[PDB]
Symmetry: C5
Subunit: 250 residues, 5 copies
């Protein structure tokens, strides 16, 4: 009956793309170089915004046919995020990066558990809270993304549960997640009102098998076993600018 | 069974921009097509001014769409004519259809001369910075069957739903379009706000209210930023 | 305990999207030739109608699902498929892209009775608007229509019909049975001069137990009557 | 504890649904069209040879609606032979104009819910009546109906949790309805557990398409289907002989 | 309460459909050059197989879902993604259209032991046929695998394994865990010289409670072994 409340940080876009190798193959090397030069300029623009504290971004190569690349971008406004989107699509090389999936969310800190001492202070001025709402992206070797929702299915209805019961379920969920400290970092984007599921979940690790371990362990925790609804899963490997030229060289 | 008052017919027209093909046009042809679109929109502005409809444009975040054209007309004939004349614009070959929704502005009984009722059936569109659209239906699933509830139960559920919505006065404006008989869900919901986080807040709060917790089925969600006709030239300039 | 039906014309709902980008590239003379051929095809349809061997009508569809629906009725599946092939062989059909179709047969849940024939071989009323959607009856746990005893189903059907009778002169329905023919169990076509009547009747029925508990719906399509004269206007950019 | 159904299995089956790309076909001049039709005609006569030496069957139906315009139903004695027919077909020049819209892989199946021959030590695959079912001759009926289906595993309606004697009863009652359509509807059941996305592909043949509606409707009120049937898409079509193809493909 | 797993090679199931119409437009010379490049690519993968750093095989797939599956196993996600990108950059890959893929890791559950290594880093038997499908365990009302206590689940897995052991020598299985990696929880590959053994084992398991009550299935793919030396014949029109 008591709705969850959230603190909300950067707006987020997960932008998945497949490379149109057949078309790219037809460009002569000089034109490929010009397009990669322009992309490097765009990416340095991204880096400038990161270095003044106004957003974040990273790129991972995606395994399988769902995508070749994910561009994960965070900005302080939907206007800025959409401007990045348009600037990217207007790049010459974007004609060769075909959209296969996207997700819009906002970094979310819910109030199921406390993130700071109660008592009148502005949480947005708490620098530990800020480090979570406006997260620096760890350059971990692997990324995992998937959206999810909470079930509203007969006797398994998360949104009919009272606050104290949801708090208990989230608390137990967090005990598992905290046991992966130093092995898995999570960024939770809330997407109710913004996209097709209720959260977009990003995990970072140097060992992709930690994704399998934590997701499996949580699936036996009642919060997920009874109430999790999952979308598609995407797994990838860190892709640094220095590796893009190689990737786009046939 | 609920009864309703019904206002303007509505089209949400979602479009993706085909940049790769647009890029191949020389600047003169791009300008010609944008000028044709500009006259199309000024003709829609006239219809808006004479009180025979409304329309607005928002840029859409993510890959679902680049633009939404939200048009309201007093007849399905007029609405279909707008749609066909839009599709026949040269520039429409570069605006690819990704999703659409058809509905009618709805006011339930949970009069047409009443000026306050008219303001809702024939709504002026607020030029808010952000839009949110999603369709939804009510469940008919085992023990969670909205349409098997007696009228008094549904009236209580709607009443509690409305109390939440009233607490967002001044922060979120809603247009509810009925679509039973017209499209694949039962309502199209359009929200307008200067702060997109208010969409997240109102939709989350309603999801813990029984009327939605037990009975709501949701389609896809679209969020966007207001786009004025005068900004189209810049958007389409590569 | 299974229902028995009387069966009439075989029906095709053929939804098409207009490929404006390609159509735009045709010079005016070629557009005119293709419209001339289409006008010949439609007069062929009209001849079958006028000798009592079928029916047909065209409506413009709102939204992106389709631009046009061609609703054709014929006395055999061979004749229905032949119309289909003739239509797709038209030059202009290259610009009418297929987006959805439905196959059904007009259903009454005797064949010399004139009143029955008027239902099995229905004249299409030239109403301003059309509504189409397919549906099935649920087989879902405790909401299982096909496990109900005949007398229960009969009662549910009765109350459904009372609602329908109250829309006499506002909505005309054609019910096509499609069990064995398409992906749902019925195709429902509604005709009216006031499209809000579609919303009213479908909503009122959805609160009736027959639909509230047991109805499963496909996509809905709503449209406006398109006469031959208005086709030339439509296809003139 | 729970006894799984056992099956006898015959020819492997491909239902290959295709849509005609009239816009592309229209751009060919008559000489090149006739030539691609000639190649198709030779292909079909080679299939006819395979049928005549008892190594398979095949038939063609025109499909109503937009799901497809044609179905090529092919039966062969091995998956290697079936896949070679498929590839050889796709390599026909005309196949570029026959766009794939749906396919189904199955194997002609005779379950052991009811007996097909007297118990004993005899090899059923030498029983000529059993063979007539496992390696079915295709009747040249005017109409075909195809749809895949599965049995539900959904809460209290779980077919695969039922004991054998209860499933036997349900199938027995199903068969009583089916046998009442003797001379009106012929069925070929292809099992596809492990081979495709549903558990069976069902093909019906009849000279009156309304018998399809009649039998399927009547069965849907039988408990075996009312409680446990899960249905895919339905396809209905009209017999198309090879000699009718030139007329079909003449614009 | 949660299962713990040993994890071996990372796996890619890469399903492709041949674009026959585009391939037909190529002159035989270009076709041969593209097939030569593919042959070199495959022989490089054979080297990786011979030094024990991975595995791969190719099967032709029945029906329209695909024409080929490329099944590749590598010791890192970096090495797997590199194979994938190298493949897509082959000229011939423009004619091998992607129709489905699966990412998993060979999994041994706890429900250098040289015998363990033979399962985690499996040699691929050159069986005449392959079967692939993904699956998950249900979390649906009263049929919720992940809410069962460990002892119940262990019993269900025990009975499941008895069935699998009775097919030893006829069916070889590779179970890939995919929780966190793809859309289902496992990818299941079966190998056999008799495709009917796929139907027999999968059917028999479906009447076992572990699958009857709790298994959720994706699409099924079946195919015939395709050696590198047979590719020229397949692609020659
Ligand atoms: C992995 C993974 C998933 C997705 C798969 C699954 O849930 O089965 C996953 C799913 C979710 C989902 C939805 C939610 C939103 C729940 C809601 O608001 O109803 C959601 C929400 C939370 N998670 Fe979560 N998670 N999660 C971690 C990993 C995963 N988490 C790790 C690691 C940590 C530990 C890091 C940290 O301290 O924040 C962690 C902690 C939290 C906390 C903080 C609670 C606490 O501190 O006690 C909240 C709130
Ligand atoms: C947002 C949103 C949704 C979408 C569903 C969701 O769970 O997100 C949403 C959904 C629906 C739906 C269906 C219905 C139709 C009920 C039915 O006929 O089943 C539906 C119907 C009503 N709503 Fe609704 N809403 N809603 C608001 C926002 C949202 N509303 C705000 C704000 C207000 C407050 C407006 C005000 O009173 O000033 C508000 C009020 C009403 C009133 C009473 C208004 C009046 O006449 O006074 C009726 C009736
Ligand atoms: C509209 C609409 C639907 C769509 C379902 C929905 O919930 O939207 C709709 C749905 C169905 C469906 C299925 C069936 C058949 C299901 C079955 O179990 O046989 C089905 C069958 C019948 N309907 Fe129906 N309808 N329906 C009307 C409109 C609609 N109807 C109007 C109007 C009338 C009143 C006209 C009259 O009195 O003749 C009317 C009456 C009947 C009668 C009684 C007349 C007769 O003998 O045929 C039968 C039987
Ligand atoms: C039509 C139709 C369907 C699909 C619609 C539905 O609701 O099932 C249909 C569906 C199925 C399905 C699955 C199965 C698989 C059962 C299982 O193994 O679970 C399945 C299996 C069988 N069917 Fe079936 N059918 N079916 C007929 C028509 C239809 N049948 C006609 C006709 C006959 C009459 C046979 C003849 O004499 O030629 C007939 C007979 C059998 C027999 C033989 C039983 C007996 O002889 O007593 C078995 C086994
Ligand atoms: C575990 C688990 C799953 C997935 C669900 C879950 O994790 O709860 C799981 C899934 C499957 C699936 C599908 C199939 C294929 C057919 C099917 O019903 O889908 C399937 C088929 C087989 N399994 Fe299976 N399993 N499985 C074990 C555990 C699991 N198994 C353990 C254990 C062993 C015994 C190995 C050991 O521990 O020493 C074992 C053995 C086999 C053998 C025989 C192998 C052999 O003799 O070498 C076959 C055939
Ligand atoms: Cl902390
Ligand atoms: Na990839
Ligand atoms: Na703030
Ligand atoms: Na966008
Ligand atoms: Na339209
Ligand atoms: Na057809
Ligand atoms: Na290699
Ligand atoms: Na194939």
């Amino acid at each position: 009956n008591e709705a969850v409340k959230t603190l909300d940080g950067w707006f987020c876009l997960h932008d998945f793309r497949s490379i149109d190798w057949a078309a790219w193959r037809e460009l002569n090397p000089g034109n490929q170089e010009l397009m990669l030069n322009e992309l490097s300029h765009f990416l340095s623009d991204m880096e400038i915004t990161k270095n003044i504290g106004e957003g974040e971004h990273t790129i991972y190569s995606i395994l399988g046919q769902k995508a070749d690349l994910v561009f994960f971008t965070l900005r302080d406004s939907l206007e800025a995020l959409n401007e990045v989107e348009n600037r990217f699509n207007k790049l010459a090389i974007a004609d060769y990066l075909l959209p296969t999936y996207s997700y819009i969310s906002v970094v979310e800190l819910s109030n199921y558990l406390a993130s700071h001492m109660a008592g009148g202070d502005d949480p947005y001025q708490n620098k530990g809270v800020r480090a979570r709402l406006y997260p620096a992206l760890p350059p971990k070797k692997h990324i995992c993304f998937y959206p999810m929702s909470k079930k509203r299915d007969g006797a398994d209805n998360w949104y009919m549960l009272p606050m104290e019961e949801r708090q208990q379920l989230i608390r137990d969920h967090g005990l598992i997640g905290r046991s992966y400290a130093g092995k898995v970092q999570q960024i939770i984007g809330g997407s109710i009102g913004f996209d097709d599921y209720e959260w977009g979940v990003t995990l970072f690790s140097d060992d992709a098998l930690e994704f399998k371990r934590i997701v499996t362990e949580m699936r036996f925790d009642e919060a997920s076993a009874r109430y999790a609804e999952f979308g598609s899963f995407f797994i990838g490997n860190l892709l640094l600018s220095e590796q893009l030229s190689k990737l786009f060289t046939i």
